[PDB]
Amino acid sequence: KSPNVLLQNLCCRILGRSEADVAQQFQYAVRVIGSNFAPTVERDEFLVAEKIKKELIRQRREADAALFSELHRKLHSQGVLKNKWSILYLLLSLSEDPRSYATLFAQALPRDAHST
Amino acid sequence: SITQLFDDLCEALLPAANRKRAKRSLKKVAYNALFTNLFQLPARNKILMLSFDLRVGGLGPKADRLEELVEELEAVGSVLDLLVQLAGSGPPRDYFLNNKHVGRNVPYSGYDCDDLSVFEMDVQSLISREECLCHSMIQETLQVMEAAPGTGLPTVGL
Amino acid sequence: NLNAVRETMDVLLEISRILNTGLDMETLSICVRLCEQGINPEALSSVIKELRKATEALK
Amino acid sequence: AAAAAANLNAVRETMDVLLEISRILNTGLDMETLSICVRLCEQGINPEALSSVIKELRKATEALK
Amino acid sequence: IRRYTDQRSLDRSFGLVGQSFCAALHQELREYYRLLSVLHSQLQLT
């Protein structure tokens, strides 16, 4: 569709409320998503594969990392996606325990050496 | 009457310089289009949906002002409902963004070279506009200086 | 109330300018008086555009 | 046609591999929410910005629960 | 300024406040090099 109504659909998805019952959260949503309608960094899909590995070893859930090692191949094998960085980076960002430091670990390419 | 205010709508949107037969035909045009829709979500949410595309196109404080005014107009509902339907078919320094020389305890971020470069573009659009005026003033008159004589003047029709 | 409806008329102007509507001050006054009767505004949006087309039909 | 169904099949397979990747991390998101989040990133969007609303709204569906 | 930073980390008697002073004499070189990098990107200037 169009992005602005799609964000309202997200707001009605997470909250149980409808779109004619909440307007401050959608206002906060247009505040935060706005002027960030694209990645502000450069994509490194290899590193974000390595970050799911570096996360699942850190949890000592080492078998599901080797399971992800085959699911990433399936991702390449199908190839209906041209944004594999965005969803996987987002899924890593929303990280929840099934049940340290990253200030020395490498971060996404910031474009501070290139005029944006 | 309400059908008389539609004559005043025809009066504002057509000035006078004939001019007594055009206004009744425009009055017909005002009446004939009103009743085709009548035979066949909140209000401020659409304002947020239009502020979003502003923020997508940059220009932060304009979206921050558009949201500022509807917040205090809710702190006349049917007239902004007309403006969202008339949108986009009408006519349309500062030293505290990339100048860190003024302020009180200015924010420390190192330096800038990535918005200071889009501080020249802020002037470059003006420099590209005020040359398009002089392109459109030399064109309207070279359309007069060069032609076969009297095809822009009705004096040959006298 | 006469204090309030001049200030709300003035704030009503800015959101008609920045939404890029065809209205200026005069047509804004005509339209605020027209909506005060009770007309649906989604209908008014078509008659204003048809007037602005048939005005250009003459010139 | 057949290629008009082959594409709609070809994205369902990927969406379920993504759903497996979604459930082995066991994020609290489901398929319906995931259908919005996939559509948003095809038009382009900052993942650090969508994570901000989702990390706000999941703690806001408990203060208003 | 770079001459000084190159010597105060060559001194372990300049102090535990000297290795605090020198911390904003590393940032003050790092941001300079960042600026030379951005200048390099727009070369392909007056």
Curated annotation (Swiss-Prot), chain A:
Cell location: Cytoplasm, Cytoskeleton, Microtubule organizing center, Centrosome
Tissue: Ubiquitously expressed.
Phosphoserine: modified positions: 100
Function in brief: Component of the gamma-tubulin ring complex (gTuRC) which mediates microtubule nucleation. The gTuRC regulates the minus-end nucleation of alpha-beta tubulin heterodimers that grow into microtubule protafilaments, a critical step in centrosome duplication and spindle formation.
Subunit structure: Component of the gamma-tubulin ring complex (gTuRC) consisting of TUBGCP2, TUBGCP3, TUBGCP4, TUBGCP5 and TUBGCP6 and gamma-tubulin TUBG1 or TUBG2. TUBGCP2, TUBGCP3, TUBGCP4, TUBGCP5 and TUBGCP6 assemble in a 5:5:2:1:1 stoichiometry; each is associated with a gamma-tubulin, thereby arranging 14 gamma-tubulins in a helical manner. Gamma-tubulin at the first position is blocked by TUBGCP3 at the last position, allowing 13 protafilaments to grow into a microtubule.
Family label: Belongs to the TUBGCP family.
Name of the protein in its database record: Gamma-tubulin complex component 3
Source lineage: Eukaryota, Metazoa, Chordata, Craniata, Vertebrata
Gene: TUBGCP3
Full-protein interval shown: 7 to 129 of 907
Swiss-Prot record, chain B:
Disulfide bond sites: none
Compartment list: Cytoplasm, Cytoskeleton, Microtubule organizing center, Centrosome
Signal peptide range in chain numbering: none
Family designation: Belongs to the TUBGCP family.
Function, as annotated: Component of the gamma-tubulin ring complex (gTuRC) which mediates microtubule nucleation. The gTuRC regulates the minus-end nucleation of alpha-beta tubulin heterodimers that grow into microtubule protafilaments, a critical step in centrosome duplication and spindle formation.
Oligomeric form and interacting partners: Component of the gamma-tubulin ring complex (gTuRC) consisting of TUBGCP2, TUBGCP3, TUBGCP4, TUBGCP5 and TUBGCP6 and gamma-tubulin TUBG1 or TUBG2. TUBGCP2, TUBGCP3, TUBGCP4, TUBGCP5 and TUBGCP6 assemble in a 5:5:2:1:1 stoichiometry; each is associated with a gamma-tubulin, thereby arranging 14 gamma-tubulins in a helical manner. Gamma-tubulin at the first position is blocked by TUBGCP3 at the last position, allowing 13 protafilaments to grow into a microtubule.
Disease field: Microcephaly and chorioretinopathy, autosomal recessive, 1: A syndrome characterized by microcephaly, cognitive impairment, underdeveloped retina and choroid, and epilepsy in some patients. The more anterior parts of the retina, near the periphery and pars plana, have a grayish hue and diminutive vasculature similar to retinopathy of prematurity. Visual impairment becomes evident during the first year of life.
Identification of the protein by name: Gamma-tubulin complex component 6
Organism: Homo sapiens
From Swiss-Prot, chain D:
Organism superkingdom: Eukaryota
Annotated keywords: Acetylation, Cytoplasm, Cytoskeleton
Cell compartment(s), UniProt: Cytoplasm, Cytoskeleton, Microtubule organizing center, Centrosome; Cytoplasm, Cytoskeleton, Spindle
Subunit structure as annotated in this protein's UniProt entry: Associates with the gamma-tubulin ring complex (gTuRC) consisting of TUBGCP2, TUBGCP3, TUBGCP4, TUBGCP5 and TUBGCP6 and gamma-tubulin TUBG1 or TUBG2; within the complex, interacts with TUBGCP3 and TUBGCP6 to form a luminal bridge with actin that stabilizes the initial structure during complex assembly. Interacts with TUBG1.
Chain's role: Required for the recruitment and the assembly of the gamma-tubulin ring complex (gTuRC) at the centrosome. The gTuRC regulates the minus-end nucleation of alpha-beta tubulin heterodimers that grow into microtubule protafilaments, a critical step in centrosome duplication and spindle formation.
Family from the record: Belongs to the MOZART1 family.
Protein name as it appears in the record: Mitotic-spindle organizing protein 1
Organism per entry: Homo sapiens
Gene: MZT1
